[PDB]
Design an enzyme around this catalytic site. Structure first.
Site: not given
Ligand SMILES: Cc1cn([C@H]2C[C@H](OP(=O)(O)O)[C@@H](COP(=O)(O)O)O2)c(=O)[nH]c1=O
Ligand SMILES: [Ca+2]
Length: 129
Positions: A15, A29, A34-35, A37, A75
């Site tokens: 993702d 992103r 959510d994919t 890891e 991102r």
């Molecule tokens: C998809 C997405 C993720 N995020 C943030 C929330 C999560 O914060 P935390 O890192 O504190 O958990 C993280 C999840 O991304 P990943 O799934 O890439 O790890 O990215 C956003 O803020 N907005 C979004 O739309």
């Molecule tokens: Ca992920």
């Protein structure tokens, strides 16, 4: 919403992808998904699916939603298209991502993705098996 040009710099995981957007390298992103890891079950399959879709594409586009365009990690947050096919939807439809991270104001394609997930789940595909 509007699609804008980008070019692939490199695949990262299921993702996230590195794209050149307005001439600048950025990690994107994928909205609303959510994919797993790479170290988790179906993680390598999600990474391989996204990699294939973006590498094989003649045209990548990014579509931002109405809300936040970057997250707290810097991102880009977008729906990503490969030759007109939305990667975010494709991952959900294959059972390689769950609909997730649905925040108010960046959720234009939420219903579309939830429909795809329901189909994947009815098919018992991948994550839903
Ligand atoms: C998809 C997405 C993720 N995020 C943030 C929330 C999560 O914060 P935390 O890192 O504190 O958990 C993280 C999840 O991304 P990943 O799934 O890439 O790890 O990215 C956003 O803020 N907005 C979004 O739309
Ligand atoms: Ca992920």
């Amino acid at each position: 919403l509007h699609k804008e040009p980008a070019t692939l710099i490199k695949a990262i995981d299921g993702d996230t992808v590195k794209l050149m957007y307005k001439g600048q390298p950025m990690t994107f992103r994928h909205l609303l998904v959510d994919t797993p890891e790479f170290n988790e079950k179906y993680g390598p399959e999600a990474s391989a699916f996204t990699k294939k879709m973006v590498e094989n594409a003649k045209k990548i586009e990014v579509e931002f939603d109405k809300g936040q365009r970057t997250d707290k990690y810097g991102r880009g947050l977008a729906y990503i298209y490969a030759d007109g096919k939305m990667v975010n939807e494709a991952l959900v439809r294959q059972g390689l991502a769950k609909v997730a991270y649905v925040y108010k104001g960046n959720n234009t394609h939420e219903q579309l993705l939830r429909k795809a997930e329901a189909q994947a789940k009815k098919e018992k595909l991948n994550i839903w098996s």
